Amino acid sequence: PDFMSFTSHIDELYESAKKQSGGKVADYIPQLAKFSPDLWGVSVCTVDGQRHSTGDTKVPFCLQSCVKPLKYAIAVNDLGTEYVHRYVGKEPSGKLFLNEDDKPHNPMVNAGAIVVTSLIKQGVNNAEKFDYVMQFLNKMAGNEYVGFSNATFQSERESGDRNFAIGYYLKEKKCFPEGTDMVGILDFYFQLCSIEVTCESASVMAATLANGGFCPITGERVLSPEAVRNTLSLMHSCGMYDFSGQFAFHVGLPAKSGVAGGILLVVPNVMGMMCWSPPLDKMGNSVKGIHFCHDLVSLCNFHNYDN
Amino acid sequence: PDFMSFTSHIDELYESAKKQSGGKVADYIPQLAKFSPDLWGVSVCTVDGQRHSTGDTKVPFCLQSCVKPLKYAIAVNDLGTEYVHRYVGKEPSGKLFLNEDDKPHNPMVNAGAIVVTSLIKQGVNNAEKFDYVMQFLNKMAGNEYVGFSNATFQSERESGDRNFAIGYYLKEKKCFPEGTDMVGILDFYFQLCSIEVTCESASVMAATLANGGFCPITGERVLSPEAVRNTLSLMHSCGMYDFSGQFAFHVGLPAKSGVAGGILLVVPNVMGMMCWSPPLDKMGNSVKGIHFCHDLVSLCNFHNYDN
Amino acid sequence: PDFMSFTSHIDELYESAKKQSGGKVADYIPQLAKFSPDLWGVSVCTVDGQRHSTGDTKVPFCLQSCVKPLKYAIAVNDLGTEYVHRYVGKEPSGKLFLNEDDKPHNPMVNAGAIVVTSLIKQGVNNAEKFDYVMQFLNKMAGNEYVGFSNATFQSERESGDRNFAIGYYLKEKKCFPEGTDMVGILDFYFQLCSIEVTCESASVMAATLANGGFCPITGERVLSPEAVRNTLSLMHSCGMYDFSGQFAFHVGLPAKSGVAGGILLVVPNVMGMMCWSPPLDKMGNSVKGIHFCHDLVSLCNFHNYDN
Amino acid sequence: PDFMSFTSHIDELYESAKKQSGGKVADYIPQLAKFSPDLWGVSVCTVDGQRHSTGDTKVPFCLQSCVKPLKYAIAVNDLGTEYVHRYVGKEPSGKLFLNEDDKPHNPMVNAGAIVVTSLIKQGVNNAEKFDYVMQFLNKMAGNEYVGFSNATFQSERESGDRNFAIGYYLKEKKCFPEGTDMVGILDFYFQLCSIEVTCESASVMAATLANGGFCPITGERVLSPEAVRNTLSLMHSCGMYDFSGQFAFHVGLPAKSGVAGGILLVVPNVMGMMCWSPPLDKMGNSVKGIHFCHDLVSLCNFHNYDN
Ligand SMILES: O=C(Cc1ccccc1)Nc1nnc(N[C@@H]2CCN(c3nnc(NC(=O)Cc4ccccc4)s3)C2)s1
């Protein structure tokens, strides 16, 4: 409807969330600790292609866990639901690495994302694999900003002892397809987490998922309907770490958060969004972003089961 | 759109699911073991009021766990989200009785339903409490069949040792509101499970939830929008026992199953349904009903994230 | 050897432990909250019959969990290792009520003691059952003080919601022998916990276990060698609540603590002891008693693996 | 007493256990699968130095987990109870890698042994560390057979994905002393597991523990009394994998089993023993060895709490 009046509300919601100074910027690597707690940006991209931005929407930041639903969508687009879910589950967990079937709980947890990473473009080397994913992300963003943080990659690889423990654990329990270089897969996993985006480019990626796989700025089909439906289902139940259950109840929208302070939000057949503010709460979610998401659903009535 | 052609498809889906002879009729009490495995009925009730039935849709059966979302909707309608969720959670579990906050995981598990039962019409005796719930269920069904099985009630009460263990456990951990007769609450809980419905009357109850709290045959407001949205959210993630996660992924519709073989299904702003076939699978869900639900979403594209 | 010099050391150890004012007297029932934190008594009874007492050794207090190894010894004496352990385990746990075989972990936990209680003198009523156990305890104490607290019994029964939850849970999982009145068994369980002893009489009970089932003051055989060996094994690994593992490592003696502040200690083929001080630590063990036990083993070198 | 008559009983017990053909020889590496299921040897070495052997007592086999109590005894001998237990627990577990304090449950589990390995001779390289342990083992065996299997070492290192997952997990949770080369510690761990012994030499090692740290054939003090007492306590409760609880109850002797089929058994102030038969049961313990241990305690009454 009237997009001009909608932007005035997005600005009001941005201003209300801006007053939330709580949270702690992630500091496990210097590449995250660097960031200012005052950084806050909201970008909207509708299914029709209408754009609106407010705040620090052109400052690049790492996708981190926000890439998990994207690399999962590529795996389903290329291999289908059946092949992918032979290796990874489709529901949240109650932490342990595997479920009762010796499979990672879902693609939104580290163990699940490491296994999904092992399914994408099997056979070729990591350089070709990375280019393949980058090309897919470029199409999803409509050729907008998609970069890479070598400093983040080197730091994640050097300090990722928990991810190496997950790696050897999955190797022991035969979780990867036959003939997988586990360490090479971890390198590719760290590379994908280090991919940089801005609120603006990432809002187009979420808009592609909100428009059934079609990019709203190019009209091009990037992902299959099967891939989008699966990704949105798992974003609705597993996207916000331990807050996933409460986010499904109070917000009810497919979303995915990252340690850099990003929250990739999808409003089915309406719009794509990307909120970003580095200070995270006890669950690891953006404080300003979680506040904004609660206000957006309460104002525009976007909830899955809102009449 | 064309309802006449839609019924032809409902009949085809009914006929396909009829060929599924697997499952085991519940036998923990004689009142359930009595039932024929061949009983199979599907009833539809749209938001506009259009009805269609196929099979054994007039044979009464107990709601059992299908009442859990209904008594939860009454609690939220009368007390609001905040009061209710001080006593019960809003997400599934990974079994234990309480979560990390000494609260039952969600209203769709026995411990959660026992606590919800303790919130409805506090102060009055069980006879007034039961009449209050029956009146609400009558309004939800549009004054259609809502009965009671005294044989089921007596049997559930005499053999419900697990529910008495849950009862004393919740009493020890101070889960009920101050001044609660725990045993009286268990009696009321067993009474609610023993309420009988037919596929036809129960399809109107699910249609009230699909029509934002308005009964499609009376036009009357039965439940508040807050109550309906909460009930549908928890039916989407906790309604099908251990199959809840897989049902959210493959079907993506608010539904609730019972040990009598019933599956109360809701299609938001479209229709209400009730499938019933006594033989249950290893998860405790109706074999014919689960098969029908998968076929319905694959044919009419009713999934939450289907474009 | 020289008993006169040994008593001087027992008095020194008593005086050192007396300075430990920490802990909290149990207050879940008024019958325990009543007790003074300054009460502290140590009684010794050697295998030869030599006695020594220091402090409040004639003030009666409830056995509480200190009765658990005693009622277990009666069950093995009458039914044998094989019959008893068909219903209860023989090792500690990592809380849940049952192990992977749907059996309580060991006889020193509430669920294990409730099941052991259901094996003693089956067939007769609770009045005959209680007299049978009291007669056994009298023989174990050499006809010394063995009383009963009706106030404790009434209070434990009225507030024992956790024990009723355990009771119905064991009934559901078919843990009791066929034809058991679960509620009657709980009544008998509460009665056994309410049996009163003094440090002096209880030291003779521990001396019977230290003298292979023979009472050191009467010379009479009370328990079979099979019963004593089993009881001592389980006291060594399960007797001190969550501190059992640390007590096995640092003290290495068969012991059992109770909520009244008692610690029934056994020194194989040497002596029986009973320490009592109502203030308990975070694990539920007597602060003065735990301190005394560590000092006794460090001074006299009584540890199981001390050369 | 009469050693000549005792050997006749050891031979009878050997012959009875020889008839037990059940079990499966470990096959995760070819170096274990190689072994014959018919291999069976029992060696005795008393505190006085009296020796007796029956069966395949001169065929070398890897210590494997039988080295865990030995390397733990060296750590306590050099660093004391307090320093060692800052890094590792002192009790069994209910599998997870760490306890509630982010410490491995006990030194008899892989995670506990890897951490113990990181405490021995810190500072020097792995070649000096290995020589230090070998020298200690030589003194414990009275200069008898102590060798090394390079084939086992290479195979354990190449296939030890579970141990590498444990390694990175302990590194993430800061379980090792500051400045530890985790991979170098894993190499040393694999080397210690690959040390070879015969029933004869290993019976002298167990006799040193049974003689309070003194080697019965040399009279030399190898381990401190504090080290021996701690090792024996943890062998009594954690030495037989998941059968530890049942072995403590029915046998009640400090013992430690290995995947090669060895069971290092200690009889305090009486004798040291080593039973070996490659076929293992579902718990990972030697079938012939477990049978022999039950018969030995039933015949000679060696149990900890046997009068
Ligand atoms: O613990 C928490 C939360 C928490 C977290 C941190 C600190 C404090 C509390 N909440 C609980 N709620 N209810 C609990 N106990 C129920 C009642 C008895 N029971 C069992 N009795 N026996 C059981 N046995 C098993 O669960 C083996 C099993 C193994 C395989 C297959 C089936 C069962 S559970 C389950 S605990």
Ligand SMILES: O=C(Cc1ccccc1)Nc1nnc(N[C@@H]2CCN(c3nnc(NC(=O)Cc4ccccc4)s3)C2)s1
């Ligand atoms: O078990 C199953 C399924 C299953 C079911 C039935 C039979 C067989 C398998 N799957 C697993 N996946 N991953 C597992 N282990 C990981 C790796 C090490 N780890 C921990 N190491 N230490 C831990 N410690 C804790 O979890 C205390 C704790 C307590 C309070 C707060 C935090 C932690 S978990 C967790 S197990």
